[PDB]
């Protein structure tokens, strides 16, 4: 009986710890693996093989090879906020119904890192 | 069916469900959102002004309107705090917690500074 928001939060918490493991942080490689499983289209769609390295570089509180949870959350903030802006510009006015397990995947394919 | 992509959709569409056409949340919209999506949370706070206080502490929140990034900073603040709690009290510790939702349980342990 968790609400939808509570379960979403739990998903994000547990996803971090799944790839972080006991050391409690993500290396660059950890983050790469995380992204390839959780944002399947995404890295490869970018026309840049240093994409994860650039992302890693632009994550708040992220400076000695390690990505903590707060830093991990800033990644999700950046992605979701950009997805929302796309949705508001291009999708919201155009349909009353949106597909679950589909729309954010579709929008992520439209994004590139600055 | 990526769990992360699903969770993002939840956060985006939850905001728009409660913000409606105007595309932002009022204090009242936020109160109704929190009451449904963080059941028990506000009531557990010992404070009839908890929502007013929360708004005050949101990011890019200045004229009575909560936009999406503002909303996201609320989710961030709650989730980061839940994670700190989890790391300290539930992860290594060892566990045997049998609730249906660990985030529901941890949320009942938080208050605003």
């Amino acid at each position: 009986m968790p609400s939808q928001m509570e379960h979403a939060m739990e998903t994000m918490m547990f996803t971090f710890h799944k790839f972080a493991g006991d050391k409690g942080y993500l290396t660059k490689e950890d983050l790469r693996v995380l992204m390839e499983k959780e944002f399947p289209g995404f890295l490869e769609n970018q026309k840049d093989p240093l994409a994860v390295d650039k992302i890693m570089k632009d994550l708040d509180q992220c400076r000695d090879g390690k990505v903590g949870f707060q830093s991990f959350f800033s990644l999700i903030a950046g992605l979701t906020i950009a997805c929302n802006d796309y949705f508001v510009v291009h999708m919201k006015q155009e349909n009353l119904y949106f597909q679950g397990d589909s729309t954010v995947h579709e929008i992520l394919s439209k994004l590139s890192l600055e | 069916p990526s769990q992360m992509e699903h969770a993002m959709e939840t956060m985006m569409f939850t905001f728009h469900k409660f913000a409606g056409d105007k595309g932002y949340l009022t204090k009242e919209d936020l109160r109704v959102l929190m009451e449904k999506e963080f059941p028990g949370f506000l009531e557990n706070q010992k404070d009839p002004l908890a929502v007013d206080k929360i708004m005050k502490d949101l990011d890019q929140c200045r004229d009575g309107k909560v936009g999406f990034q503002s909303f996201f900073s609320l989710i961030a603040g709650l989730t980061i705090a839940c994670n700190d709690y989890f790391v300290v009290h539930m992860k290594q510790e060892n566990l045997y917690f049998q609730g249906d939702s660990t985030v529901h349980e941890i949320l009942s342990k938080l208050s605003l500074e």
């Binding site: 992302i55 632009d58 994550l59 708040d60 509180q61 707060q70 959350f73 800033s74 990644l75 903030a77 950046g78 992605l79 906020i81 950009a82 802006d85 796309y86 439209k110 994004l111 590139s112 890192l113 600055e114 | 990011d59 900073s73 961030a76």
Partner: peptide, 8 residues
């Protein structure tokens, strides 16, 4: 919180 910028 610093946030990376993605564009479309």
């Amino acid at each position: 919180m610093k946030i990376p910028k993605f564009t479309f």
